[PDB]
Structure formats: structure tokens, C-alpha cells
Design a protein around this ligand. Structure first.
Ligand SMILES: Cc1ncc(C[n+]2csc(CCO)c2C)c(N)n1
Length: 388
């Protein structure tokens, strides 16, 4: 059968991604509860996340197939508990970097969470259970941001209690994570009957350029998803007017879900339109990031994030569809693992150069000009490849 591990995995997926304090994190740190300047948050604290998601990406896969997918989720649950407990009680510029380290390990073990599906389930429901679990996680994050902003704007709720709610939700997620079945076989190591065949994998012109774009777009979206809240804080601090972070990130994630639903139900010639459909929405992404940089009204920057996140989820779902058709299931996770490693190398290089003190030590203003130029260079590369 398949239904019980699906139900426990979707319960873990709902109560993990219900993090109501997640949109309001940058008003929580720079707010009156802590003594943290926004220069130290922009330039010393958040880049550690990218660092911790590079150095702990490749070992976690090694600690995924060997433990056959169960205890890495339990490590993610312990990571949840440690991260939000340190968000509750932790003080200083030193402890908040440890927070970013453990949040990097959270983002690392998310891949093992998704990879448990093809390990425990009988192969008749490889399509059904994965789409179910991903939909449950997306609905969890959307409803979490909805409940967050409603409780804040209509409940006089300080942010510390919202982190308490987040701790409780990820703690309940840790209590569901223990009650999963250890699967019978893994996907690479513990299969009872690959380096030399790996050159044959990326020897495909329909699979290299799309993977390269997935890497650059994933790095850019992780950067923008990091620093968009510090940009929102810079445009209008939380002590002036009560900003609406949870509602806008909720509508943005809902639009991302609508875009991902809209990718798989449009029947046009993909090779002919794809030399244009990538280009126009890449221009949309570049214009959205430029719009968030140049503006001074806060709803204009919110609308820039809405248009950017919907356009990214559109184009990156198109990319995931244009990779997945050719290969099998076992090669799919290896290809996306190498692609994710390349994306985090690119994001680490760009975060050392642009963001951190070892590079330029930039404020959050000029940063989004650089990220908009990065996606504009991406759109120019697509325009040049259409011109070939
Ligand atoms: C503890 C912690 N939380 C969030 C971020 C930044 N961040 C990563 S993803 C995301 C939104 C996901 O939809 C945000 C705001 C961070 N650096 N550390």
C-alpha cells in the first residue's frame, strides 16, 4: 500500500511549512526586541545561510541514501526546533549566524524530504504522492503567511509570540517525523541488484543549457528571496507604518502555485514558443527587480515581488518540465543534485562578491540593482540564443 506514509508525510509537510514568523523575520530582528543594525543583518548575518547551504549540501545527500531517507527528516526536525528556539531566545551577532547555519541545514534536508516519496511508495503512485506532498507544502506556506498577517494586523500580536507559534508548529512536525516507516530500499546505495556513466548524463544539448539556466535562476531566486525583506525594511521601517509582509508573501506564493498549475495545462509547440516564452517573462523578471530597486512607494515594491515570484515560478516550472521528460527517475535526482550544487556554488560566489564584508560590503539598495542586472543579463543571454 501507500496511503499511511503519504498521510504522515503530508502532516509533516503541513506542520513544517506553517511558519507564521517566516515573513516577519526582518521586522523581528531589526525591531525593538533586538539590538541589531540593518547593516549587520544585510552584510554579516544572512550570507552565512548561503554558506551553510553550500558546505552542507553534498554531505547531506551522502547522509540521505545511506540512512534510507528516514533519519535525515528527523535531523531536519531537530534543526527546526534548534533554529526557532534560537530565534526566540538567542541574542547577538554571533548567535544569529548559528541560526542561519541551522536554517541552511533545514534547506538542505528539504531535498531528502522530497526524495523519500519515491523510496517508500509503490511505483504506481510516483506521480500522485509527489504532487500531493508538494501541494500540501505550498498550501501550508500560503496559509501560514495568511494566518500570520491576519493575526498581526487584527490581533495586536507581537512578533515573539508568532515565533512561538512557529516553534510549536515545527515541534508538532518533529512529533510526526518520528512516526514514519523506514523504507526497504534506497535509490543509489542500498539497492540490491555510476561515476563512469555520469559523463553520458549531461551529454545532451536538450539537457545542458536548461540545467545551466536552472542553476543560475535558482541562485538568483535564492538571493532575491533572502534580501527582499531587507529591501522592504529599507523602503519603510516597521516603526513608521505597519507593513503587510505576510499578506504579500501569501499572495505571491499563491500566485506561484497558480503559475505552476498553469505551466502543465497549456498545449503549444514547446520548441517554437520556448525561444520566446522564456525571453518575454525573463524581461518581466528583470523589469520587476528594477521596479523594486527604483521605487519609493512600498506597494510598488510589493507588486514587484509579486510579479517576480509568479514569473520565476512560471519559468522555473517550465525548466523543470523541460528537463524531466527525457530521463528516468533515478537519474533525475542525480541530475538535480548536481544542478543544485552548481546553483549554490554560483550563489556563494555572488554572495561573497556582492553582499558580504569580504567583497564589497554593500547596503540593500545597490544589491537589487545588481540582482536585476543579473536577471537582465539572463534575459539578454536568452535573447542572444533566440537570435542564433
Ligand atoms: C531563519 C531564516 N529564515 C529566512 C531567511 C531568508 N529566507 C529564506 S527563504 C525565505 C522565504 C521562503 O519562502 C526567506 C525569508 C534566513 N536567511 N534565515
Amino acid at each position: 500500500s501507500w496511503i499511511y506514509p503519504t498521510v504522515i508525510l503530508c502532516l509533516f509537510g503541513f506542520f513544517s511549512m506553517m511558519r507564521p514568523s517566516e515573513p516577519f523575520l526582518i521586522p523581528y530582528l531589526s525591531g525593538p526586541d533586538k539590538n541589531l543594525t540593518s547593516a549587520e543583518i544585510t552584510n554579516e548575518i544572512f550570507p552565512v545561510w548561503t554558506y551553510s547551504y553550500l558546505v552542507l549540501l553534498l554531505p547531506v545527500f551522502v547522509l540521505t541514501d545511506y540512512v534510507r531517507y528516514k533519519p535525515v527528516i528527523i535531523l531536519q526536525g531537530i534543526s527546526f526546533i534548534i533554529t526557532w528556539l534560537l530565534l526566540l531566545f538567542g541574542q547577538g551577532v554571533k548567535t544569529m549566524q548559528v541560526v542561519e547555519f541551522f536554517y541552511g541545514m533545514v534547506t538542505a534536508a528539504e531535498v531528502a524530504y522530497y526524495a523519500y516519496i519515491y523510496s517508500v511508495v509503490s511505483p504506481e503512485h510516483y506521480q500522485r504522492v509527489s504532487g500531493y506532498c508538494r501541494s500540501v507544502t505550498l498550501a501550508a506556506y500560503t496559509a501560514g503567511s495568511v494566518l500570520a498577517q491576519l493575526l498581526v494586523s487584527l490581533a495586536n500580536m507581537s512578533y515573539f509570540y508568532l515565533n512561538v507559534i512557529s516553534l510549536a508548529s515545527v515541534s508538532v512536525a518533529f512529533l510526526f517525523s518520528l512516526f514514519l516507516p523506514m523504507p526497504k530500499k534506497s535509490m543509489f546505495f542500498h539497492a540490491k541488484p555510476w561515476f563512469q556513466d555520469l559523463k553520458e548524463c549531461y551529454s545532451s544539448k536538450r539537457l545542458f543549457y536548461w540545467s545551466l539556466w536552472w542553476a543560475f535562476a535558482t541562485a538568483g531566486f535564492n538571493q532575491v528571496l533572502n534580501y527582499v525583506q531587507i529591501l522592504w525594511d529599507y523602503k519603510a521601517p516597521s516603526q513608521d507604518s505597519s507593513i503587510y509582509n505576510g499578506a504579500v508573501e501569501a499572495i505571491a506564493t499563491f500566485g506561484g502555485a497558480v503559475a505552476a498549475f498553469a505551466v502543465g495545462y497549456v498545449k503549444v509547440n514547446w520548441d517554437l514558443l520556448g525561444e520566446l516564452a522564456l525571453v518575454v517573462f525573463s524581461v518581466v523578471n528583470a523589469g520587476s527587480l528594477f521596479l523594486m530597486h527604483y521605487t519609493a512607494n512600498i506597494w510598488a515594491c510589493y507588486a514587484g515581488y509579486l510579479i517576480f515570484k509568479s514569473s520565476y515560478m512560471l519559468l522555473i516550472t517550465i525548466a523543470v518540465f523541460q528537463i524531466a521528460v527525457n530521463l528516468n527517475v533515478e537519474r533525475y535526482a542525480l541530475v538535480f543534485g548536481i544542478n543544485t550544487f552548481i546553483a549554490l556554488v554560483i550563489q556563494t560566489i555572488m554572495t561573497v562578491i556582492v553582499v558580504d564584508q569580504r567583497g564589497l560590503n554593500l547596503p540593500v539598495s545597490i544589491q537589487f540593482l545588481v540582482y536585476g542586472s543579473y536577471f537582465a543579463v539572463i534575459a539578454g543571454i536568452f535573447l542572444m540564443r533566440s537570435m542564433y
